[PDB]
Amino acid sequence: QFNPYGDNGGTILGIAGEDFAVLAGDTRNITDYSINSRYEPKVFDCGDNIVMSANGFAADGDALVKRFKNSVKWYHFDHNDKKLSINSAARNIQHLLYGKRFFPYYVHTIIAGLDEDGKGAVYSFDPVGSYEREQCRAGGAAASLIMPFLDNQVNFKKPLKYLSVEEVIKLVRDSFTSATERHIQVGDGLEILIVTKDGVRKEFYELKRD
Amino acid sequence: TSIGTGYDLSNSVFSPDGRNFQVEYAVKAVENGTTSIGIKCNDGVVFAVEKLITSKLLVPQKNVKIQVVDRHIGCVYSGLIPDGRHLVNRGREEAASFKKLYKTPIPIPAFADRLGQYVQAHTLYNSVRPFGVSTIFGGVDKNGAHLYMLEPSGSYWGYKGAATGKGRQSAKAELEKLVDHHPEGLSAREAVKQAAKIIYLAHEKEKDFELEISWCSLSETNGLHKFVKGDLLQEAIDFAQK
Amino acid sequence: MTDRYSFSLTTFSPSGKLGQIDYALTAVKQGVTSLGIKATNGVVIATEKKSSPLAMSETLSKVSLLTPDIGAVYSGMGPDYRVLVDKSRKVAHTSYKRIYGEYPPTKLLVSEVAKIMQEATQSGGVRPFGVSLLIAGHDEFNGFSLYQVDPSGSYFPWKATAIGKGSVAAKTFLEKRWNDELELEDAIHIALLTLKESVEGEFNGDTIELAIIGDENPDLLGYTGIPTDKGPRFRKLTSQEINDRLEA
Amino acid sequence: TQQPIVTGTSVISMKYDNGVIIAADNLGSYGSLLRFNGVERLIPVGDNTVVGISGDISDMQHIERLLKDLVTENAYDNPLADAEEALEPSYIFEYLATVMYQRRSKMNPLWNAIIVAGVQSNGDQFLRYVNLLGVTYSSPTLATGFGAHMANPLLRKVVDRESDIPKTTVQVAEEAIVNAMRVLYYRDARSSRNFSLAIIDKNTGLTFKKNLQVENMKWDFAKD
Amino acid sequence: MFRNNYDGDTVTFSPTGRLFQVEYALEAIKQGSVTVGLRSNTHAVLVALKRNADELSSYQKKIIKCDEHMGLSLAGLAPDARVLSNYLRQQCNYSSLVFNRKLAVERAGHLLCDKAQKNTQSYGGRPYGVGLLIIGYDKSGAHLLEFQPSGNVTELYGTAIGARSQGAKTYLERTLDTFIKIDGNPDELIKAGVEAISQSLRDESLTVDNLSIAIVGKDTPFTIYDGEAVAKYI
Amino acid sequence: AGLSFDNYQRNNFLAENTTIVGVKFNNGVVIAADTRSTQGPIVADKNCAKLHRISPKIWCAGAGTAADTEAVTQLIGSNIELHSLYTSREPRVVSALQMLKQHLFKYQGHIGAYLIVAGVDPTGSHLFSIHAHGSTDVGYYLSLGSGSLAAMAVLESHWKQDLTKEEAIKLASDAIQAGIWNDLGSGSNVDVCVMEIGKDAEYLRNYLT
Amino acid sequence: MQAIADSFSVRLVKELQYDNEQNLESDFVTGASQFQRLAPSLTVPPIASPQQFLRAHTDDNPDCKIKIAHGTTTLAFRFQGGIIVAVDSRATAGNWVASQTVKKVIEINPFLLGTMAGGAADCQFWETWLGSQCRLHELREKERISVAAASKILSNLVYQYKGAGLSMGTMICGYTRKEGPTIYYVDSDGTRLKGDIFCVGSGQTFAYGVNYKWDLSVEDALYLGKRSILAAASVNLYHVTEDGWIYHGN
Amino acid sequence: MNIVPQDTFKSQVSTDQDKSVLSSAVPSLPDTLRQQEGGAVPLSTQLNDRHPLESTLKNWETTQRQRQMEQYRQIFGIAEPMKRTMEMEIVNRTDFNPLSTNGSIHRDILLNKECSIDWEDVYPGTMVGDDVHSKIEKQLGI
Amino acid sequence: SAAGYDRHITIFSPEGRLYQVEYAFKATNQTNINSLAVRGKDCTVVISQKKVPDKLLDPTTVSYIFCISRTIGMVVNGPIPDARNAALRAKAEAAEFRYKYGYDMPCDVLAKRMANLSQIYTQRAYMRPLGVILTFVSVDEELGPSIYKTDPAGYYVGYKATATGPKQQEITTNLENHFKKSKIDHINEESWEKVVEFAITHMIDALGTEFSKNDLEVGVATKDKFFTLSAENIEERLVA
């Protein structure tokens, strides 16, 4: 029988700050032991200060992101251009994922943004829609390496609540550099999206290409 | 009688004399439309339309009263504008389907038959009404030049020269004279001049009018439908005036 | 959603009559005469082939075989009769032949035809059929039978009857000329005599159509070898036979 | 569908400073039998797009029909269908990728790998890849099948990053593509010596070269 | 008297050859308030006069955004305007989702004409009774279209529809050479539109409650100004 | 409507827990068969009629699933009778072949009927073989059944173009006799049917005893 | 009739599969009707054996496995003061950091509680859907829905999909004036069982030592539930009365 | 241009897919009592373990008709399939016989089945809701 | 006048008649054209009068004779749109018969099929009858030369020879007189050209007017094909 699933293994990481959020991912797109591309972004700005990433089978994640963005367009049309909150986006994504309960997307989804009070918020999803709000979550091939690095560096050790944006960016870069040194599927590049009250900012860094 | 009382309030009904009065009323609607003519020359067709002068607010290049169905088929209509647009869309769809299926541009008789069947199908049920347009179309295919006229009843015929609209009688008289005076035939440019003359004679009118001329000729346009450019249009207008 | 239904074309009048059925009966009364006579050893069905002089009479036949033992004739509108005959031939196989391995008896096929005709009066899409049918047949457990079916779908059995333009006079003649000891040949002669008074123009074998339900015909079976295979009992007389009977 | 029968091997492509180059061989195989010679696998769409298809040949012809129908429907009741309303490479790729993913989701896939190459109306290069699963990606060099394992390492030595694109001329890129095709003919058993190439340049437009043959083959050291 | 016997539905011609239900649908446009549209080589502008039921009510929305590059104003039946605006939004969404294209204004006009023609030849429904003015900016520049619910679309530099629109239309036609060359200066074009729509006022004055403006342009997405945002234009 | 699929899952759950020849001769066709009917190794009937009548001059004999063969033959016979009444013409063998082929192709081989069909019509004499999946073939002499190899050997031994009626009858009888002697599936008697152009069909029950 | 003509007038849309209204709705082409269905639409693979496909593709490397609810011990019992629900609140750890306490008890509404077991997504999704259904019912009937009706709604829902792949076991607990306090157990096999004491999960035998009488005070009942959970083994406690549920925490 | 029916499998399911038997108490759920299927038939069981020929047989005639319409469209134009479909719709729409299941004569004439018999013709074939009023409600859509 | 709902639909009048059918019959004579059909020994000939008074028309596009199949030809009396509708329907019917039954459709069977369709039109309230009369001719492989006619009432029948149109009575009378003289039902000729000449002469005598090459259309059916003659063929036939 035809196998409709694939694997384009990558690594993503979402962290919620005091009044900011960050969602980062490696830009390597691979098939088995081959490299499809060295810069293929997986973290997207979906409007209304919400960043999204769906790591795993790339086609399913692209379809999920496309559907969510179209739904956001219709939400703006039907509700006087009301801003979509992060919790409402999480509920919409849960419904989108569970709509494929018997033919699921083969992805793990992380979204990030600012809540109603202005605090950073990150939501993590299981493949069929089970979701939770978290302070920090890593997903993909090198999560089991990235998480201990952050746990050693930070206390959830200066507390996470008093860290600035630059310090969080440095921690993410160091963890990804270590994972690149240890994991074959991690490298080439790292892209980070930062959400604050002023909007979304993108930063890019190079990683080892071997 | 032109008014069939008791037999004209629903489509697809026969009168005691065997007439269908809704189709006749659609013909009456056609007869009040703008005058349009078509002339079949030696190796092509020429279409001419009289149009009213509108406001300057209309974009000059986005207002064309002669429709192109396919690269080799030209068409004009008299009657209801939306019905004409619908019929032209159907004709374009039929031509595209035929060209996709059989790798050749559709011959004019086959296109005419498909349009005629579509129009006739609207005289069969009381839930629709007949089209309120008469269409003069034509073009060039491997067998030569063809000019056809189609009526609201679905009846169509091939013509040496056709006319429709308010000034149909004068235009038909001029076309008959042109046929009589040219038993050998006529060329494309002479056809353009005569079409301009016939449109001017038929118009003779409230304030002013404009003239649109298109042609498809094997020798002139390589069997393609093209609008008449500035020089030839000006020459035709000058010939018509004097 | 006004196109999901169509109001009934057949309705009751204040007096209590269905107008369309009455008008179909009127159309039946304006048709060519057709008669049937039941004898002790057969049934005769006769009609007049009223027609253009350039039309070939043999091409159009008003007597149709429904089963090898059942035939029918009509008075009224020809196309409705043709449609009903096709349907009856199909129904004889769908409901009986493919179920019991046998052809239906005459009464059951008559009932099927009558139901089909009745359904045309409970409709908002069609008007009732404009024909009256005479169906003659034979079956093992009921013998010979003759039935008349009306446009309303009502049917009744007859010893002898006639329908069409000259139905009243033909009925009077049959009433004065029928007995329970009649034979098939006598029935044929009486049918010819009754049709003689109805036909206005040429009265020969080219303007009369006759059929009989009598004994089995092994010569029409088309094959030999099975003694228990009964031949058809329906037989349409040729023009030569009609001429011979008229001359005698 | 559900099994390939007649197939083509690989398509390769790269970006240079002013455009893109794509190439593919002209063979349709029937298993181990090299059955059909003369199969064109580069489909030019408009004056600015080229689509290279590898895999099932019948599905490739279906895709060609879809592309022709798209071109025809673009010009339907469109006066400036060739001046300002002509099809863009991005539009064609978006349609093709949507079709591929939808047919994957139906468990009725098209067994092909597709590369779209061209130049956008603003002069930007476009080069993207989709496959039967609906997986899409972009890179300065792209290849399908065996080429992805052998042509890409050769092409990445010329264009390794984005900053290398402005430094690469058309001559260097064409030479790299030709050498990659020669290597593929050396080491691919389902390959052919005949291939077609297409150059899309923001200045010179579309140049389509057919009947190109692998030359300068080092069959000399086999004597001993 | 004789018209009364042949105006029952849209599938009936009169003995003189007239389709009266479509004419009535066209007449329904003048029951709405005046809207004006104009354009230059770089921008397109709509100006609408809004009405309220009474002093305790709000004003009707006459300008609706279809896509970041295209919008429209309406005059006539409210349900038909709602239906057509939603349909145009759906078509633009389909274009963006499937082809990553911005839907052309001419394509939208053709689609509207095709949709509107069907209701004028079949039994069961009624013709639409709202007129539309569509502005947009695409690869061919700025575009203004007038849609008539009989199934007609025209391309114009400027026009006006609704009650008493003749004065605004005459003003626009007289001063065509003025606003046809207002390139790169949106304020002048908007002011010209405001003056044109003021030409159609009868014992009324433009306020910050009954005036609505919309603009689209080369680098300007379709933007709607209401309330204080139009105060400087009064 | 039609053949039912009810109790298919239930039946799955419960499960989890002849010689026929046709010969053409110069003025017609002949079909012949044996009369042994068995249910496994047991002889159920020593005198079984395997020649069936689609129409008075079109006959057939089948193999495979017996119920399917009988049902398909009867359905096609009903269709042929209705078509002949509708057209007022003698039925043609080609029409029966077309109906059988399309009906069998509709069911995608799930109706296990394999047929030899012989007939005479106003166009002449015809002989056809029909497979369960819907393929059909033409031939001058055909064999079918478990004893078809021996019968085909006899037919290949003594067949020629210029065959009279008597020679064709003898050849068909000899082929059936060979299938009778050398095959455990056959053995009792020989039934023959001769269809000659311009004459009635002749059905000879127990031609050889 | 013209609709028939449009149906027969022309490929691209057919290949996109967008000629079907369901596909257009699922991709939000014509609007947001997809997010307006009271009964959710579930996608299935268009093949002969969807169940085998799902079972094969779910029982097999990355973090993309379907999340399973905690197998921790949960206890529910009923007394004259209402209902006591106790859940051992030991939280499993992974490559993530929790923002706050993770709740293993779903709050269907301010009067109904459910317990998660099996598939976490199934329990959460279908109990939120059940809350929506209960709210609509109470709006229609102008009265609070009984526990039996809600449990029956959930049971019928899960029975309609029996064998498809759903995995869930929940305890619906509620206090109404007509019924008093009531506890039902509903699982993905369609079973719906009314009861007095329920112990689910690992160590249920030890927690089934519930000293139980219908005269226990609120404090005594809370202490008994806490002690039973500790014997099974922090503990999360819920006290459901006619006025709703109250969360204690311990 | 299909011969064997295709695209027969269902792509989405829901508890309210059968609009005619929806429960009045819970409109999102079906009414099992009025279904009259035995009371123990979940919809999911209809998605598995089907006979592979059932879908081919159930949609065979429709597939052949669609192929015929496509051929007419290719060769004759849009008008011919439009007229055939219009005639069939008109005939099927005005026939309402709640006490009978046999097809009309005119339908058979249009389908060119005047003298043709298939097993659907030979084999054409409660406590709750099998009366005239249910058929009236289904026909009128009320 | 129908005087009721029969002014629109086909239902019974109190006299028992269908007025819409009779009005379709009246519509069949709109074109004011006569047609004749005769049978030879091995051919069938149809001749239709052509009237093109307008000088702007193209005569080559004016025809009421259609080729239905390889062996069947058709002549239609009535308006040309219904004629073309019926022609397309007949072509489809013949092809479907060949596909379904494995042999070419006979002329009489096709006539019966069209008559059954007309019966549908007569009985259905929402379907109108076509206002045309159809005449199918062929050389059937079983019956030889064949002429059959169908009308809007759903009635069909075969003829030794036929004439249709406003002046059909005189042509029919002349045919009857000739057949009474010859005492045969067909024309005793061996070549279809002679049959064509005889039919032209019969038409000229019956109508009392002379015909040129452009005033008539001729179709000939043989056992192989049905074909329509051109202007040159008719001009050659006139010279005799």
What domains are defined for chain C?
Answer: 1-248 (3.60.20.10)
Interface contact A45, partner G, CB < 8 A:
no
Q: Which tokens in the block code for residue F83?
A: 């078509």
Whether residue B62 contacts residue E104, with contact meaning beta carbons closer than 8 Å, is answered with no
The string of DSSP codes covering H65-129 is HHHHHHHHHHHT-SHHHHHHHHHHHHHHHT---TT--PPPHHHHHHTT-TT---HHHH-----SS
Q: Are chains D and I in contact at 3+ CB pairs closer than 8 Å?
A: no
Whether residue E182 contacts residue E39, with contact meaning beta carbons closer than 8 Å, is answered with no
Residue B180, min C-alpha distance to chain D (Å): 39
| CB atoms C126 and I115 under 8 Å | no
* Chain C positions with Cβ closer than 8 Å to F: 65, 86, 89-90, 93, 97-98, 221-226
Neighbours of chain B (3+ CB pairs under 8 A): D, E, G, H, I
Q: How many Cβ pairs closer than 8 A exist between chain B and G? A: 13
Whether residue E67 contacts residue E103, with contact meaning beta carbons closer than 8 Å, is answered with yes
For C185, how many CA atoms within 13 A lie in the half-sphere containing its CB?
4
For C12, how many CA atoms within 13 A lie in the half-sphere containing its CB?
3
The answer for A 64-93 residues in CB contact with G (under 8 A) is 66-67, 70-71, 73-75, 78, 92
Helix H, strand E, coil C: the string for E44-74 is EEEEEECCECCCCCCECCCEEEEECCEEEEE
Distance, in Å, from the CA atom of I165 to the CA atom of I176, rounded to the nearest integer, reads 17
Q: Token pair 């399939």 is at which residue?
A: H81
Locate the domains of chain B by residue range.
5-242
Helix residue ranges per DSSP H, chain A? 58-78, 86-98, 143-153, 165-182
| CB atoms I154 and C60 under 8 Å | no
Find the CATH number of the domain harbouring G178: 3.60.20.10
* Range of the structural domain that residue E225 is part of: 4-234
Residue I136: count of CB within 10 angstroms of its CB: 32
Distance, in Å, from the CA atom of H124 to the CA atom of H103, rounded to the nearest integer, reads 10
Q: Which of F94, F83, F151, F150 is nearest to F117 (CA)?
A: F94
| CB atoms I11 and C127 under 8 Å | yes
The class of domain F18-209 in CATH terms is alpha beta
Comparing alpha-carbon positions, the chain G residue that sits nearest to D110 is: G15
How many domains is chain A built from?
1
Interface contact A78, partner E, CB < 8 A:
no
DSSP annotation of C126 reads B
How many domains is chain G built from?
1
Comparing alpha-carbon positions, the chain D residue that sits nearest to E139 is: D84
Q: Which of A76, A17, A88 is nearest to A50 (CA)?
A: A88
Distance, in Å, from the CA atom of C158 to the CA atom of C43, rounded to the nearest integer, reads 11
Whether residue D41 contacts residue D26, with contact meaning beta carbons closer than 8 Å, is answered with yes
Find the CATH number of the domain harbouring E24: 3.60.20.10
Please work out, in degrees rounded to the nearest 5, the angle formed at the alpha carbon of residue B100 by the alpha carbons of B98 and B101: 65
Comparing alpha-carbon positions, the chain B residue that sits nearest to H79 is: B118
How many domains is chain E built from?
1
Residues in chain H within 8 Å Cβ distance of C98: 117, 122
Find the CATH number of the domain harbouring A61: 3.60.20.10
Whether residue F44 contacts residue F36, with contact meaning beta carbons closer than 8 Å, is answered with no
| Mutate: best of A2, A8, A55, partner D, most D CBs <10 A | A2
Looking at G29-94, which runs of residues are DSSP E strands?
42-43, 74-79, 82-88
Residues in chain C: 248
Q: Which tokens in the block code for residue H142?
A: 């009320």
How many domains is chain D built from?
1
* Range of the structural domain that residue A205 is part of: 1-210
* Chain H positions with Cβ closer than 8 Å to I: 72, 76, 80, 87, 90-91, 94, 106, 109-110, 112, 114
Residue F90, min C-alpha distance to chain I (Å): 10
Q: Are chains E and I in contact at 3+ CB pairs closer than 8 Å?
A: no
Burial of I216 (0-12, 13-18, 19+ CB in 10 A): buried
Whether residue A112 contacts residue A50, with contact meaning beta carbons closer than 8 Å, is answered with yes
Distance, in Å, from the CA atom of I188 to the CA atom of I190, rounded to the nearest integer, reads 7
Interface contact E155, partner D, CB < 8 A:
no
Q: Which of F150, F107, F156, F125 is nearest to F31 (CA)?
A: F125
Q: How far is CA B101 from CA B13, B93, G188, in A?
A: 38, 12, 54
* Range of the structural domain that residue G84 is part of: 72-250
**Could you give the domains of chain I?**
4-240 (3.60.20.10)
Interface contact G139, partner H, CB < 8 A:
no
Q: Which tokens in the block code for residue E222?
A: 């379709």
Residue A137, min C-alpha distance to chain G (Å): 4
Residue type for A169, please? I
Whether residue B116 contacts residue I84, with contact meaning beta carbons closer than 8 Å, is answered with yes
| CB atoms C125 and H139 under 8 Å | no
Burial of B198 (0-12, 13-18, 19+ CB in 10 A): buried
Q: Which of E168, E153, E229, E158 is nearest to E201 (CA)?
A: E168
Distance, in Å, from the CA atom of I231 to the CA atom of I212, rounded to the nearest integer, reads 10
Residues in chain F: 209
Comparing alpha-carbon positions, the chain C residue that sits nearest to I149 is: C55
Q: Are chains D and G in contact at 3+ CB pairs closer than 8 Å?
A: yes
Whether residue G206 contacts residue G184, with contact meaning beta carbons closer than 8 Å, is answered with no
| CB atoms D137 and A58 under 8 Å | yes
Residues making up the binding site of G for bortezomib: 120
Residue B235: count of CB within 10 angstroms of its CB: 15
| Mutate: best of G15, G24, G26, G52, partner D, most D CBs <10 A | G15
| CB atoms I10 and C127 under 8 Å | yes
| Mutate: best of D62, D77, D80, partner B, most B CBs <10 A | D77
Helix H, strand E, coil C: the string for E128-162 is CCEEEEEEEEECCEEEEEEEECCCEEEEECEEEEC
Q: Cα A203 to the chain's mean position, in Å? A: 14
Residues in chain G: 250
Distance, in Å, from the CA atom of C87 to the CA atom of I159, rounded to the nearest integer, reads 27
Distance, in Å, from the CA atom of G238 to the CA atom of G84, rounded to the nearest integer, reads 6
For chain I, the farthest-separated pair of C-alpha atoms sits apart, in whole angstroms, at 57
Contacts of F14 (CB under 8 A, 6+ apart): none
Residues in chain F within 8 Å Cβ distance of H46: none
Whether residue I122 contacts residue I153, with contact meaning beta carbons closer than 8 Å, is answered with yes
Find the CATH number of the domain harbouring D14: 3.60.20.10
Q: Which tokens in the block code for residue C142?
A: 């009921």
Q: Check: CATH 3.40.50.1580 for B5-242?
A: no
Whether residue G1 contacts residue B127, with contact meaning beta carbons closer than 8 Å, is answered with yes
Interface contact B93, partner H, CB < 8 A:
yes
Residues in chain F within 8 Å Cβ distance of H119: 1-3, 75
Residue G32 covered by a domain: no
SS3 F192: strand
Comparing alpha-carbon positions, the chain A residue that sits nearest to G51 is: A102
Residue G113 covered by a domain: yes
Residues in chain I: 240
Which of B29, B57, B89 is opposite residue E13, by nearest beta carbon? B29
Residue G56 covered by a domain: no
Burial of I183 (0-12, 13-18, 19+ CB in 10 A): exposed
